[PDB]
PDB file of C-alpha atoms and ligand atoms in Angstrom:
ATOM      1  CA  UNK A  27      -9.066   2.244  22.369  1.00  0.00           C
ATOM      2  CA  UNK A  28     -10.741   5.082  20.821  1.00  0.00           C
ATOM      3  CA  UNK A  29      -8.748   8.078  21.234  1.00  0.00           C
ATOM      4  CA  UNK A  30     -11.674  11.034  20.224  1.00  0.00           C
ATOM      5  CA  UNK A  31     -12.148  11.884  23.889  1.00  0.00           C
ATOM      6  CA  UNK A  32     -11.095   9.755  26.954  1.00  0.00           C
ATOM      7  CA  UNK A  33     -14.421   8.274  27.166  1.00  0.00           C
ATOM      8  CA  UNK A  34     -13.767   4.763  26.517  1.00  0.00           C
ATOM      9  CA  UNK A  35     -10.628   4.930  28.853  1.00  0.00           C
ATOM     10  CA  UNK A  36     -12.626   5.475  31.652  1.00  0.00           C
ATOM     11  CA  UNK A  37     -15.096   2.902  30.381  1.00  0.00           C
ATOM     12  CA  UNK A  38     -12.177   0.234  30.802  1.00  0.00           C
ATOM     13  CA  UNK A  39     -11.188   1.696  34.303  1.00  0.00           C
ATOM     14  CA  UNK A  40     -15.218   1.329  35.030  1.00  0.00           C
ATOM     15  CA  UNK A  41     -15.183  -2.096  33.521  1.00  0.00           C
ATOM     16  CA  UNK A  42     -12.752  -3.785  35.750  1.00  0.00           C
ATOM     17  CA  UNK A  43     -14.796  -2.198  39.019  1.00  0.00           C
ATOM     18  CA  UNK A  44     -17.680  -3.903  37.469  1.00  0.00           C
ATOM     19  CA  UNK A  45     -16.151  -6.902  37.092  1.00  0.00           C
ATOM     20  CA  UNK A  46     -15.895  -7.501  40.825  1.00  0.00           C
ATOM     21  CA  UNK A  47     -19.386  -6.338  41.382  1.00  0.00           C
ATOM     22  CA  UNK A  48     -20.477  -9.104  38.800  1.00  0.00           C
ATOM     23  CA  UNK A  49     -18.124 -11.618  40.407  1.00  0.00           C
ATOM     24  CA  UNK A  50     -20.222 -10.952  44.071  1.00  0.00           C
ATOM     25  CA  UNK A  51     -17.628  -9.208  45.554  1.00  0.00           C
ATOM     26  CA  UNK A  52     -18.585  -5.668  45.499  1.00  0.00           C
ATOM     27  CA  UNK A  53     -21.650  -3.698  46.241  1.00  0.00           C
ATOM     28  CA  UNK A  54     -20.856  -0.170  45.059  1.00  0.00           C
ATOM     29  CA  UNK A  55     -19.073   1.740  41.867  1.00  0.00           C
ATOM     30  CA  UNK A  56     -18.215   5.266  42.480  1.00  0.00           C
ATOM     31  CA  UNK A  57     -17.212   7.026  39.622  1.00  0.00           C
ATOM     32  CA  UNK A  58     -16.329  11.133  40.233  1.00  0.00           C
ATOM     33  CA  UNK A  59     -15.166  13.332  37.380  1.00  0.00           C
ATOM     34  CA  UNK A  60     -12.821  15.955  38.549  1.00  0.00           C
ATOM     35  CA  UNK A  61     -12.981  19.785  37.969  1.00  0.00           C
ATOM     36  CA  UNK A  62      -9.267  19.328  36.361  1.00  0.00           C
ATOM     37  CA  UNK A  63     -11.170  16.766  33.539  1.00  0.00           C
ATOM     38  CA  UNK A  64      -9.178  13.920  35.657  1.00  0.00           C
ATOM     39  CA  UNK A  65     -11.773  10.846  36.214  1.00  0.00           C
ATOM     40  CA  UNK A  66     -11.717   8.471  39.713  1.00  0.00           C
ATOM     41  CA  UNK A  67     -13.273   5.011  39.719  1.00  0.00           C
ATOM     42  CA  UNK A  68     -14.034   3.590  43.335  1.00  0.00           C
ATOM     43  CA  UNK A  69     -15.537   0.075  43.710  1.00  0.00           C
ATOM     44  CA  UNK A  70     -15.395  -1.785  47.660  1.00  0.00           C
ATOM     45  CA  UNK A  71     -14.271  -5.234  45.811  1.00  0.00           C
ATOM     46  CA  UNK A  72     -11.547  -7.145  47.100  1.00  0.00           C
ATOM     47  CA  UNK A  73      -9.056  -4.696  45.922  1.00  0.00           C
ATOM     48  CA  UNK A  74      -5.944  -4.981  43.456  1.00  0.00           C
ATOM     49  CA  UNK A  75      -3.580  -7.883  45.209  1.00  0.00           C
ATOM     50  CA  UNK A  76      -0.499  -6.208  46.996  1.00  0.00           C
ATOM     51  CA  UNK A  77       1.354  -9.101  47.244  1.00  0.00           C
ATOM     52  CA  UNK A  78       4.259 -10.102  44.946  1.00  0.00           C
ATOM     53  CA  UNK A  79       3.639 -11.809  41.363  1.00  0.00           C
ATOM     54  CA  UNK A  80       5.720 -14.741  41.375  1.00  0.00           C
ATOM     55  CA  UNK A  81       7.455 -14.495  37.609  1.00  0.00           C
ATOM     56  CA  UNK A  82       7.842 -11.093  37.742  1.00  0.00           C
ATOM     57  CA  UNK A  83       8.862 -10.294  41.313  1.00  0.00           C
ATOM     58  CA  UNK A  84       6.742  -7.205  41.786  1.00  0.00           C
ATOM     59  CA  UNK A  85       3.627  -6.235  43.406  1.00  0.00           C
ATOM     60  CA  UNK A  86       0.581  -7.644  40.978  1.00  0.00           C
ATOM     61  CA  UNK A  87      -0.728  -4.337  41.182  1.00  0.00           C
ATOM     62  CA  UNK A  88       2.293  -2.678  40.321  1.00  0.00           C
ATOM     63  CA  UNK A  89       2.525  -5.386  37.012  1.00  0.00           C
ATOM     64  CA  UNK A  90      -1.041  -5.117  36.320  1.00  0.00           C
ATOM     65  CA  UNK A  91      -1.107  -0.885  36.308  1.00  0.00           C
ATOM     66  CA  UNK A  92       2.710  -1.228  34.198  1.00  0.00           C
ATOM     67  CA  UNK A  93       0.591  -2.916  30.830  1.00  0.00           C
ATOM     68  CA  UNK A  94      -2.487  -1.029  31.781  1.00  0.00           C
ATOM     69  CA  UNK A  95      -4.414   1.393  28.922  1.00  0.00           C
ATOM     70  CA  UNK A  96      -4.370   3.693  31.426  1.00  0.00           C
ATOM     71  CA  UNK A  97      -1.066   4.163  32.493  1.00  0.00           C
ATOM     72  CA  UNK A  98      -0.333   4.620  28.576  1.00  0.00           C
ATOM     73  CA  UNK A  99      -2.744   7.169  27.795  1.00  0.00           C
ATOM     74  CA  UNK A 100      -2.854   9.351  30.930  1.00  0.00           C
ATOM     75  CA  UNK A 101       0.243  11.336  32.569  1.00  0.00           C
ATOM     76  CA  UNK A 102      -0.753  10.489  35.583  1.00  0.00           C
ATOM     77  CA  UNK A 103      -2.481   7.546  37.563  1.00  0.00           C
ATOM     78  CA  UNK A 104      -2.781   6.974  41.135  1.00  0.00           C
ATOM     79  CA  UNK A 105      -4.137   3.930  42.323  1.00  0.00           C
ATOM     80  CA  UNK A 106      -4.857   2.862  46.163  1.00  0.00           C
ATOM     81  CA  UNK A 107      -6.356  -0.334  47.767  1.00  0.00           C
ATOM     82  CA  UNK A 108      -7.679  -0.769  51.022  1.00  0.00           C
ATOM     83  CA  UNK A 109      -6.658  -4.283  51.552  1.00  0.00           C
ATOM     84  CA  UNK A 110      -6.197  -6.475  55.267  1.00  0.00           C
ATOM     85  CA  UNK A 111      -6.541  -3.307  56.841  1.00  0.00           C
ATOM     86  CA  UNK A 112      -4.399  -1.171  55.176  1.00  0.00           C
ATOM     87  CA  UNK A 113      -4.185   1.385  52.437  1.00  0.00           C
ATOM     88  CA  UNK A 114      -1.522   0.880  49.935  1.00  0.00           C
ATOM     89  CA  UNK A 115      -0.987   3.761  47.586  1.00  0.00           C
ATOM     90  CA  UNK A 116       0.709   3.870  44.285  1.00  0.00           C
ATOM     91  CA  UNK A 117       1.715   5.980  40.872  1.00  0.00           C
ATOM     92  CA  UNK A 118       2.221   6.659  37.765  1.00  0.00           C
ATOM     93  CA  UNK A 119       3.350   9.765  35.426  1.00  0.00           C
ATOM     94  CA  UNK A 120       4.076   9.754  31.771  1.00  0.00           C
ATOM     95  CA  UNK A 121       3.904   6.394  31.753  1.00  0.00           C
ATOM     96  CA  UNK A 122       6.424   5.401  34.588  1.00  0.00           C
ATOM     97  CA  UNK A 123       6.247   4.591  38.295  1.00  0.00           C
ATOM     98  CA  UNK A 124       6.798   7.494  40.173  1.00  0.00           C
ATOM     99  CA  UNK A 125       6.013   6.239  43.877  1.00  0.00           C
ATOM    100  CA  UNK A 126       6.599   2.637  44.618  1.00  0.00           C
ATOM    101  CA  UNK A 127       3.604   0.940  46.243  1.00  0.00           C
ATOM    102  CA  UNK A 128       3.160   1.679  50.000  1.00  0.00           C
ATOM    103  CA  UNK A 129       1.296   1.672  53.128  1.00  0.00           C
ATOM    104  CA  UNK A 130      -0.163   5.215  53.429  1.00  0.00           C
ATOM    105  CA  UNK A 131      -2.778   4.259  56.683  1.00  0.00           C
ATOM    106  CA  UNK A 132      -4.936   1.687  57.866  1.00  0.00           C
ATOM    107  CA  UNK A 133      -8.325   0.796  57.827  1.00  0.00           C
ATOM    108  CA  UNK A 134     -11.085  -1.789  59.233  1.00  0.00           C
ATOM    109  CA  UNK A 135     -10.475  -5.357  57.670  1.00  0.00           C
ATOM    110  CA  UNK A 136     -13.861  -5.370  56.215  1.00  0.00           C
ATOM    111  CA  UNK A 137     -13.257  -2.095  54.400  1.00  0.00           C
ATOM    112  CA  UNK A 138     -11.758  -3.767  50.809  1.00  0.00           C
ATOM    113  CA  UNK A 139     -11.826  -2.210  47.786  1.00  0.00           C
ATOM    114  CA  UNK A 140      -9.693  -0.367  44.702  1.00  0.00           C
ATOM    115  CA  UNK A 141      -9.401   3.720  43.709  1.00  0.00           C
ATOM    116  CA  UNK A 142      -7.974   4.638  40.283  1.00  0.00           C
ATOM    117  CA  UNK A 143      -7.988   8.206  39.473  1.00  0.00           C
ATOM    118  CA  UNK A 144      -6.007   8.975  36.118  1.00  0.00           C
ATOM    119  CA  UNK A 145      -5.420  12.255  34.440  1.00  0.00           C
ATOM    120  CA  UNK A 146      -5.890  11.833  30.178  1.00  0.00           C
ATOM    121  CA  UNK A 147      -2.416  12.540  28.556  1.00  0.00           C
ATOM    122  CA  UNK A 148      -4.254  15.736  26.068  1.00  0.00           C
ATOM    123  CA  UNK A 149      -1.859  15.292  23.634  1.00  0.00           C
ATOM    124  CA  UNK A 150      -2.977  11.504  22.635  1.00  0.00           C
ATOM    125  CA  UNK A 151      -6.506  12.591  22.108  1.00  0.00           C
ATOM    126  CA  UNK A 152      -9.108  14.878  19.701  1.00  0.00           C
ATOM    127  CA  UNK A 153     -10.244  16.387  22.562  1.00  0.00           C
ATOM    128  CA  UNK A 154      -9.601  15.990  26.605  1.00  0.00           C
ATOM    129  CA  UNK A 155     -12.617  16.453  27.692  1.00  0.00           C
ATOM    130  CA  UNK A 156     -14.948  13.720  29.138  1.00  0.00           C
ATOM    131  CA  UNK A 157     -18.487  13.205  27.214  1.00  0.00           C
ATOM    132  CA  UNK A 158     -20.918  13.646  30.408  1.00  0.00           C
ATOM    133  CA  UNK A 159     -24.059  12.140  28.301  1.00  0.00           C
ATOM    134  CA  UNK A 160     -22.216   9.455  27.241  1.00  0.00           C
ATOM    135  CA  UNK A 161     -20.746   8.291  30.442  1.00  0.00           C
ATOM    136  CA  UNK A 162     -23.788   8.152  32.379  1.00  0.00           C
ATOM    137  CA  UNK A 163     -25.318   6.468  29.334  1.00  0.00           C
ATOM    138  CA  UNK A 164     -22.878   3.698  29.514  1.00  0.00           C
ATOM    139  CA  UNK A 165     -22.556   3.450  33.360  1.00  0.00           C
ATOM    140  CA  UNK A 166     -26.638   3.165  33.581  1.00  0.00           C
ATOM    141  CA  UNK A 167     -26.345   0.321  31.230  1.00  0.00           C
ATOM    142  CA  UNK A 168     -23.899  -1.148  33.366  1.00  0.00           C
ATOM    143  CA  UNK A 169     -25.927  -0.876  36.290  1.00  0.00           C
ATOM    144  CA  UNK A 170     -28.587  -2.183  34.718  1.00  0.00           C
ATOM    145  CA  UNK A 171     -26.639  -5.357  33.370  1.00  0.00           C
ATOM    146  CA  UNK A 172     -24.966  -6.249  36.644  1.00  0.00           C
ATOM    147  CA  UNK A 173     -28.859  -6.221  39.219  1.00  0.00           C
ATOM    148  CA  UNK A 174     -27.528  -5.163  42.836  1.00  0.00           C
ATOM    149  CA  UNK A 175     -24.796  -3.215  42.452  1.00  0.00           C
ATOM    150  CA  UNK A 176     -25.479   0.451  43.271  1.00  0.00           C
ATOM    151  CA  UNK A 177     -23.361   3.016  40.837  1.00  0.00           C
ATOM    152  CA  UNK A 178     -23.371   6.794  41.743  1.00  0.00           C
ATOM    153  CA  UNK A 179     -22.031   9.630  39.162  1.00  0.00           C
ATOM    154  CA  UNK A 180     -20.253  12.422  40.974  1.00  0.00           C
ATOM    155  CA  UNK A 181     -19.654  15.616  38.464  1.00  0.00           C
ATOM    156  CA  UNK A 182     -17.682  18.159  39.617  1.00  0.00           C
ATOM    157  CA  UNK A 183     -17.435  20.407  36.082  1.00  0.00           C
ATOM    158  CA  UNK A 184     -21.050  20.452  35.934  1.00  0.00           C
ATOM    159  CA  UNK A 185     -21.999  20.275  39.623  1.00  0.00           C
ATOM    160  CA  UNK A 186     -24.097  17.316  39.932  1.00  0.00           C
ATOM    161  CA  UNK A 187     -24.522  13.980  41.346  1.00  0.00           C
ATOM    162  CA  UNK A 188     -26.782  10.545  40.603  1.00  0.00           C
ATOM    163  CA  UNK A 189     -27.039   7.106  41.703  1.00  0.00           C
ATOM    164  CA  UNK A 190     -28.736   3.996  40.280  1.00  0.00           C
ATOM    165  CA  UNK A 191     -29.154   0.088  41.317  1.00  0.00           C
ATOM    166  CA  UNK A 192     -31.347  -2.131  39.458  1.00  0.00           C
ATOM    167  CA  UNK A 193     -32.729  -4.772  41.668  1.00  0.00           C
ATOM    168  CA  UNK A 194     -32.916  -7.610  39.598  1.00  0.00           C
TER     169      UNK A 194
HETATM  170  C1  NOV B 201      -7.529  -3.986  37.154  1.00  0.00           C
HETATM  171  O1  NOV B 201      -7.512  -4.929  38.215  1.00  0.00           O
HETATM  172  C2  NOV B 201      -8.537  -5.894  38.110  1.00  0.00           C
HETATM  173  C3  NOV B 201      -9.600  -5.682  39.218  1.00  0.00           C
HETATM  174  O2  NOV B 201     -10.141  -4.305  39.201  1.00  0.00           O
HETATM  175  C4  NOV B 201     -10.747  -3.841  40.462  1.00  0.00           C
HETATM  176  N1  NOV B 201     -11.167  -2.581  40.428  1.00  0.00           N
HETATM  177  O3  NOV B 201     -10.860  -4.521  41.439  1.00  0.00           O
HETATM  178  C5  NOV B 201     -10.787  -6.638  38.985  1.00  0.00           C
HETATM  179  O4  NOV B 201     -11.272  -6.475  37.803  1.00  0.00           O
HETATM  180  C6  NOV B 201     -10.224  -8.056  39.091  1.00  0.00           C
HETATM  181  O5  NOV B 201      -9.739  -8.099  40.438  1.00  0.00           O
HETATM  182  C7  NOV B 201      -9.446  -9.281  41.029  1.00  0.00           C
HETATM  183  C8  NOV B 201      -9.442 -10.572  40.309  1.00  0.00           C
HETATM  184  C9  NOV B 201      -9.168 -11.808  41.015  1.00  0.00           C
HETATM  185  C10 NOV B 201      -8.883 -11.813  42.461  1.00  0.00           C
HETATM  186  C11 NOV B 201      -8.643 -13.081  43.149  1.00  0.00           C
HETATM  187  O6  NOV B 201      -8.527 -14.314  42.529  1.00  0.00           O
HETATM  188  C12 NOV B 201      -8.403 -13.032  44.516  1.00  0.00           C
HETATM  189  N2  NOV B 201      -8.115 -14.171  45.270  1.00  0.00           N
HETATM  190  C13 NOV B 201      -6.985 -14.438  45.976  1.00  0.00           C
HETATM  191  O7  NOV B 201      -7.119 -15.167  46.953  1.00  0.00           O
HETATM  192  C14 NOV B 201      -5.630 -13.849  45.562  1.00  0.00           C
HETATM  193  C15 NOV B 201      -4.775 -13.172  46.532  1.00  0.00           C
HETATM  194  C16 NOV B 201      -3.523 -12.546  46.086  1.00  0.00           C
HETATM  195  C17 NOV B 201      -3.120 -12.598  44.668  1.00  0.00           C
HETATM  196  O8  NOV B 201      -1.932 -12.028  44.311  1.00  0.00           O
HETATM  197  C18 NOV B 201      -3.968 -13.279  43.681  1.00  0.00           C
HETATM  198  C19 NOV B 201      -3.633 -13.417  42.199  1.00  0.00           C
HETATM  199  C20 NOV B 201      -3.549 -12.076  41.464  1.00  0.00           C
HETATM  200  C21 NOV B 201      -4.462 -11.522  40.652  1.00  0.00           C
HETATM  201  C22 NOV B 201      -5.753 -12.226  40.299  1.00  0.00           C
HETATM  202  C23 NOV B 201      -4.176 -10.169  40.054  1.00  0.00           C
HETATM  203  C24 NOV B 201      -5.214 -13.900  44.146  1.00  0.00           C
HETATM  204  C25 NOV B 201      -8.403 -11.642  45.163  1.00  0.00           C
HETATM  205  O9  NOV B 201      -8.140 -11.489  46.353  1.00  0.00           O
HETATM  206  O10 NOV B 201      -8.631 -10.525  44.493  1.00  0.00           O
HETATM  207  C26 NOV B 201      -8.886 -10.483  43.148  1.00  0.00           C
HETATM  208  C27 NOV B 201      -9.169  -9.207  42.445  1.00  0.00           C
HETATM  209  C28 NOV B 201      -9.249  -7.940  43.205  1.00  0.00           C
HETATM  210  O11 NOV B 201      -9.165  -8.302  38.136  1.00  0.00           O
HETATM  211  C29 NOV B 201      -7.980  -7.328  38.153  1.00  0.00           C
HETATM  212  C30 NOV B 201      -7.045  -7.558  39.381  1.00  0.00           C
HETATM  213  C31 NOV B 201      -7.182  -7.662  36.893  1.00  0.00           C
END
């Protein structure tokens, strides 16, 4: 991972959003960059399993966000999944789980789908600031590489917003 600017962080994050989009499971990618430099990917996939991983003994979420690039870059990262009908909520800070995963509400069945919002750790990179150009660059690609799946672009520092969807 490429540590001039969180860029390609986020473009992991981003990556595994597409990845259900590509897989037929989700429709939409919502990426917002906060006015605190802090970046929040939203996809309505299936969202990050809950449930227990057998070897381990913890949720699969919990596992997955522990080995994550994210959690080891960024001080903080707060993941929630609207799964079954609920909202399960769960974080990190310097690295380690702060809140253990739980319900924090409810929602329709149909409503599935994963949040990650991470703040950059500063002190691990050139610069903490996010590269607007290149992110849209990138995402637009994305959209344009995975036909159906509508992305939007929410910025917050620089007051703006876009979407794009490609057809076919
Ligand atoms: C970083 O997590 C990523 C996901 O990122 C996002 N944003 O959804 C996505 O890229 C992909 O997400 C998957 C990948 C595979 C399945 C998948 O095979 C499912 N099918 C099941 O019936 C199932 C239900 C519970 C469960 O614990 C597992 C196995 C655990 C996995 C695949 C982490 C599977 C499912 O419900 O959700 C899935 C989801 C949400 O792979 C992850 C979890 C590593």
């Amino acid at each position: 991972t490429d540590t001039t600017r969180p860029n390609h962080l986020g473009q992991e994050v981003i990556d595994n959003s597409v990845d259900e989009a590509l897989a037929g499971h989700a429709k939409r990618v919502d990426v917002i960059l906060h006015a605190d430099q802090s970046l929040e990917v939203i996809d309505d996939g299936r969202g990050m399993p809950v449930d227990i991983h057998p070897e381990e003994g913890v949720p699969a979420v919990e596992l997955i966000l522990c080995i994550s690039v994210v959690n080891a870059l960024s001080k903080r990262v707060e993941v929630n999944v609207r799964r079954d009908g609920q909202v399960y909520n769960i974080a990190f800070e310097n690295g380690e789980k702060v809140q253990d995963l739980q319900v924090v509400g409810t929602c329709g069945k149909r409503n599935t789908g994963t949040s990650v919002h991470f703040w950059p750790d500063e002190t691990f990179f050139d610069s903490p600031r996010f590269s607007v150009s290149r992110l849209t660059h990138v995402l637009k690609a994305k959209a344009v590489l995975c036909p159906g799946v509508e992305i939007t672009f929410k910025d917050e520092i620089n007051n703006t917003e876009q979407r794009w969807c490609y057809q076919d």
